[model samples]
Target: TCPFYKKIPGTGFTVDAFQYGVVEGCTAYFLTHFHSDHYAGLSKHFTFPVYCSEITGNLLKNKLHVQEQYIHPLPLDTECIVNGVKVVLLDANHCPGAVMILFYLPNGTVILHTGDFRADPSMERSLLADQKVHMLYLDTTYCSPEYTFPSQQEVIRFAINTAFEAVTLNPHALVVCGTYSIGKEKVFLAIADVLGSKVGMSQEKYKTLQCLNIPEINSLITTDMCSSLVHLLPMMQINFKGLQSHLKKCGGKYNQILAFRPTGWTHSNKFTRIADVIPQTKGNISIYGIPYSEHSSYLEMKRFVQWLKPQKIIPTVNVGTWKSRSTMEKYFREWKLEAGY
Candidate 1:
């Protein structure tokens, strides 16, 4: 969610827009989650107080080598005061350590910054339920109506069931799941449990996954490629050309390769046993685009705006220019009017 202005309207705090050198008087540099684009400009040498969810803070300390003293890991759903500014962190439900930040200024104005989130119904019962939000810095990633997709749960089940059938057909088949360093852990892990297989990954990626502290995930990961037919790699490695080299290294042990590129771009409300999976078949290699997304859908985004009804909504993600910003404003206006405000 990149925008030209990182400042949170009259406040010294900036959220999820770390770029270049530090701001003149930045209250505290806040990172909503631990994604690359969001944490782009952050470096080990930069010395400034930073804030994020507890798990996110822990990850930064362990993985990024950001000093522990400079990090502030705030508790979820609690009022933590900072120089008379009260801040609350709520679960974003988009990823494991992701959070939606709420700021209470001394002047009684409430600000909400949604850092890469999906609109789950449980969010309606948050601390912000009763309190009216004065300004909302939104995660408008898929703000348009055309970007409809299934939930993470649906896509996980689809991947599991689909892979099970494919593996049953060819017992010696290999399954590779495409994932970012952090986000799509649940899908691959869940599929591994169902298929009764271990997850293979690089030692470096394994260490990062350990930072998540998931109770059931540790025993399932194996660095050895021979132990498990299922593996997790960065999304770039899931393609046919890259996988062909992997097959060459395997030395013909795997007869067939089935890879899943889990993303929300391949939308399908159509499926039989599995939900919407766009399959691409080439010889012995198959890559299926699974609609497992962390961002909110268009309808979900619309529903969130209508329910929250913030006095002002600021576009976060696709606001690079006036056209995109105005397009988002039109949708915001429509949603607000529909909410009878």
Candidate 2:
């Protein structure tokens, strides 16, 4: 996939397309989430009206420091008109503030802009129960057939079970979970909730979490690194070498380290098969590449497309080359045909 699409044709706005210095004619910028890739170009100097979910708006204000006057925070699942188009921000099922924008143009065109979303049963029931979509601007990050993954729910359960097993094997194996700027919170929350473990996090991480307004976070998170069992770290810091470094830095606070590298890219076999041989050890560190992804997998995406049956499917990512774009287009065509469109 590419960094972004040119624009949402027929509209004077761009959703998650922030590369263009100022996007000449674009009247506004609509962010699907607060991920770095989506908000790269937005800064203090941004002058155009920026629209996003209420949580994402706060993140934009707190993290990016974009001016408040330029920010337009929309309530999720509520209808609002922007640039003469009916817009609604539905939970994207990707992250805390991720939103799937459903737009109904003045010309009666119905389009759904899926910004890095996961199509779960919850989404099928809550978001897509009865929407007639015409065009779809989808995040084709894992459009290929080889991208099947376990459900996010099951993945988190496996992670919780694995962490519990590690704790049982060696309670000294302080659990460290790798996460995103604001994604896969379910995994950590589930780990803490099910295991009844306290979280150790950085001051910076604490600042980010506060903006999210998670009520349970107040009791679950702690600033003391040595006292907590589960330590939340960025995805980069949970790697093998990084874990070793952290062990060294911690000065033997815990003899062994248990880290979870949670992401969908690391799994393939439908259920626990791929992760069965997990909690692999190296020296004194134990790590598991959990298949906990925020993005939709091949099956989920297929179900989404087949259900929606949009008139046109416009991929927003992995379309950098004609071959890749065509490959994605082929899937769209195949799914459309199967959906009896």
Candidate 3:
């Protein structure tokens, strides 16, 4: 029960995924974010009471049509009790309304579930001031050393500047930015703010953003094709064929298409921080891969583990399978061994 879900003993509450046998037995559930992978087996019809942030609850109601009665919205940073366990939600800093859950058991044990978040010092300072973490379920998506990337702020700035440069180079060229369905709204808003225009998105994507009820985001979203020089697109739509199909349908107003892929995978090899623009082109479109990631990198993960100093660090990816003791030891031995029990 790694990436799919986790079951907390004594409380009978499940985290993320709603696998049949697992979810059926649990009394309550906790959802970290609106990522599809996190809610692998969840269906529209859920019987048990599901707890999540306000934004997630709205998405569950508007997008997936989950009944409002079954959804429980929890305020961020506030402590609440679910079945005997004291729980609090902290902003994950990954995406809008994403949170890292901290559970303090009745027996004085603290368990933290970091549901896909970038390493932010402010978040760490807010929680875990003096409390020791008994167990830490970490998001080790970039656990290897080769995943060093730039900060999200730098990447966003690079993307905005790149889009502006692309447009300046070719006035009629359409600049497309690739992002996830639920995350990276900041990038779109930044580009829109800088360009003094609204960002274009499909009607389906627009509805999902509407659920957030963000005034600036609502104002930035539009269905107009040629209204803005910068357009927001799904991460998968930045490819050659995807652009070709889109361009074919959109008349001939755009002479060129510049694509920006702001993701962690862009800096898979070596330490590529500072968002160095990749000089590459896909078909007739210019493509740049910026080091904009929502997940923590290897070095950042090490620093987090060092600061938290949990008794047990559980990899929340493959879970029980592929548990590499040496890998874990090599990464955390410096801080953990030096701590001296």
**Order of the predicted models by lDDT, top scorer first:** 1, 2, 3
Regions of model 2 farther than 4 Å from truth: 1-4, 126-131, 267-275
Candidate 2, residues 144-192, lDDT tens digits: the string is 9888777776787777787787778886677788876787777777787
TM-score of 1: 0.94
> Of the candidates numbered 1 and 3, which has the greater lDDT value?
1
**Global lDDT for candidate 3?**
0.77
Best by lDDT: 1
* Clash-forming residue pairs, model 2: 1-317, 1-318, 2-318
**Candidate 1: deviation at residue 182, Å?**
1.4
Q: Against the unseen true structure, what C-alpha lDDT does each candidate score?
A: 0.82, 0.80, 0.77
Clashing pairs in 3: none
The true-structure Cα RMSD of candidate 1 reads 2.3
> Residue 181 in model 1: shift from native, Å?
3.4
Each candidate: RMSD to true structure? 2.3, 2.5, 2.4
Give the TM-score of each candidate. Answer: 0.94, 0.92, 0.91
Candidate 1 backbone collisions, by pair: none
Q: Which one is best on TM-score?
A: 1
